[PDB]
Structure formats: structure tokens, C-alpha cells
Amino acid sequence: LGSQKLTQLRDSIRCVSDLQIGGEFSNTPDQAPEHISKDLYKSAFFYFEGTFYNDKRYPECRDLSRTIIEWSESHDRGYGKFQTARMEDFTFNDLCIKLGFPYLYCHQGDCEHVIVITDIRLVHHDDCLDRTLYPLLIKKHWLWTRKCFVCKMYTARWVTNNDSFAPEDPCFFCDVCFRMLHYDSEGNKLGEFLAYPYVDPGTFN
DNA sequence: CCATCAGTGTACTAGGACCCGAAAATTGAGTTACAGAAGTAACTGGTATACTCTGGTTTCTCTTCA
Numbered sequence: 621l622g623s624q625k626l627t628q629l630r631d632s633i634r635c636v637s638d639l640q641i642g643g644e645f646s647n648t649p650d651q652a653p654e655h656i657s658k659d660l661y662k663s664a665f666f667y668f669e670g671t672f673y674n675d676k677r678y679p680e681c682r683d684l685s686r687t688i689i690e691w692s693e694s695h696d697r698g699y700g701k702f703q704t705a706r707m708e709d710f711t712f713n714d715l716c717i718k719l720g721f722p723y724l725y726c727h728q729g730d731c732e733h734v735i736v737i738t739d740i741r742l743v744h745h746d747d748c749l750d751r752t753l754y755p756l757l758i759k760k761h762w763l764w765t766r767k768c769f770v771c772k773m774y775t776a777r778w779v780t781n782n783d784s785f786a787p788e789d790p791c792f793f794c795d796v797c798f799r800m801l802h803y804d805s806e807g808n809k810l811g812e813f814l815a816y817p818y819v820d821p822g823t824f825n
Numbered sequence: 826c827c828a829t830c831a832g833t834g835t836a837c838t839a840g841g842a843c844c845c846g847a848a849a850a851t852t853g854a855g856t857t858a859c860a861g862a863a864g865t866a867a868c869t870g871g872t873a874t875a876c877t878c879t880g881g882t883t884t885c886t887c888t889t890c891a
């Protein structure tokens with residue numbers, strides 16, 4: 621919605637990089653899940669025609685654009701004259717952009733999404749008229765879902781690297797086939813591996 | 826009747842070559858130096874496969890002693 625703050629769209633973009641759980645759970649897979657990456661790395665920024673609207677709303681937020689502006693303040697790199705902003709003092713109605721031109725939305729460190737303002741139109745009477753739901757999803761992609769590599773009946777909850785049982789190197793397992801292949805009777809890892817929790821992108825996105 | 830179990834009708838991948846254009850880089854001529862290395866362009870021996878009388882040979886009647 622025009623005249624609707626930025627960070628009203630940043631908080632709406634469903635990306636699975638917000639739901640990834642950190643750390644490795646090989647020794648014991650019953651650990652209290654570390655906070656999803658939505659909570660740990662709260663920083664993000666839009667880039668709209670030479671101005672990094674940074675999400676400095678929270679204290680855990682740090683300037684992701686500082687890296688780029690420093691990297692460009694060095695040796696000339698094509699780019700030049702980068703700006704900054706705060707993304708809570710801005711609405712889409714205050715923004716000076718091109719249509720159909722790719723801009724940036726970086727979040728979770730370097731999960732980059734290419735933003736394209738396809739068109740701008742005055743609101744009609746036959747579309748949604750609310751605001752409580754308006755940065756709303758017109759279309760999404762319906763990605764594929766990874767499955768457990770042992771039995772192809774359930775989706776992958778775990779991804780293991782350097783597994784001394786897996787044929788493939790990154791091997792995805794459901795919970796059942798993971799518990800059954802790597803753990804003797806009480807949680808002592810059998811063999812060697814690095815198991816991480818796997819958020820299926822084709823499910824939470 | 827609620828279990829199960831191929832097919833199906835598709836956008837969504839997965840390899841798998843392959844192409845289209847752009848931008849950067851080179852090539853090319855022009856000069857004038859510089860030293861040295863390629864790069865043909867030229868006359869001038871040197872030793873073998875035919876080769877041409879020729880020196881010897883060979884019966885074959887004869888020459889010359891004996």
C-alpha cells in the first residue's frame with residue numbers, strides 16, 4: 621500500500637532465511653531449538669535507487685549497508701554517491717523509484733531479494749479495502765519440498781554433512797530416519813557427522 | 826466404506842548444449858631511434874651410377890724351329 625511505512629513490507633516478506641535454526645545438533649538432537657534467525661539477526665535494508673533504507677528499528681539491528689558503503693568508498697567500483705536512511709521514517713509514498721527496475725532487499729546477513737515495483741495504481745473498489753492485511757501476497761511460487769532420503773514419505777527435518785552413513789554428502793532426513801540411523805539407544809551419536817536442523821524452503825515459503 | 830494404489834495433467838525443475846550481443850582488447854600504419862636475432866637469398870664443391878673404349882682372353886688354325 622502506498623503511504624504505508626517501509627518495515628510494513630520488510631516484516632511481511634516471507635523468506636525461509638528467517639526461520640533457520642543455528643548450531644549443530646549432532647551430539648544430541650533434542651536440544652532446545654536456538655531462536656530462529658528471525659530473532660537473532662534483526663537487521664535488513666532496502667536499496668531503492670542509491671539510498672539504503674536501513675532497518676535500525678531494533679537494538680539488535682546493525683547497519684548492513686555500512687559494508688557496502690565502505691566497499692564503495694574504496695577504489696571506484698562503478699557505483700557512487702550512496703545514501704542512507706532509516707526505513708521507519710519512510711513510506712512507499714515518499715519514495716523516488718523507477719518502475720520495472722530491479723532494486724534490493726537484503727536481510728539475514730546476505731539473503732538478497734530483488735525487488736521490482738511492477739506498477740502503481742490508485743486503489744479500486746473491487747480489491748481488498750483493509751489495511752490490517754494489505755501488504756498481501758498476490759502470488760507465490762509453490763517451491764518443491766525436499767524429502768527424507770531414506771524413505772521418501774516424509775519431508776526433511778535434518779541435513780547431515782560428513783555422515784558416515786549417508787551416500788550423498790548433504791543428506792536430508794526426516795525425524796524418524798534420522799533417529800534410527802545415527803543414535804544407538806540413548807542419544808550417543810553413532811559414527812561421525814554434523815547434523816543441522818533443516819527448514820524446508822518449499823514448506824515455510 | 827475406508828482403507829490402497831497407477832494414472833494423470835500439469836507448471837517446475839534438471840541437465841545440456843548453444844547462441845547473441847556487448848565490451849574490452851588487439852591489430853594495424855606512421856614516424857625514429859636502438860642491438861641483435863631470424864630468415865631467406867644467393868654461388869660453389871664433391872662424390873657416386875652409368876659408360877666407353879680397352880686390355881686381356883680364347884680357341885683355332887698355323888709359325889717357327891727342332
Ligand SMILES: [Zn+2]
Pocket residue numbers: 635636637638727728731732733
Ligand atoms: Zn530472504
Ligand SMILES: [Zn+2]
Pocket residue numbers: 768769770771772773774793794795796797798
Ligand atoms: Zn525418512
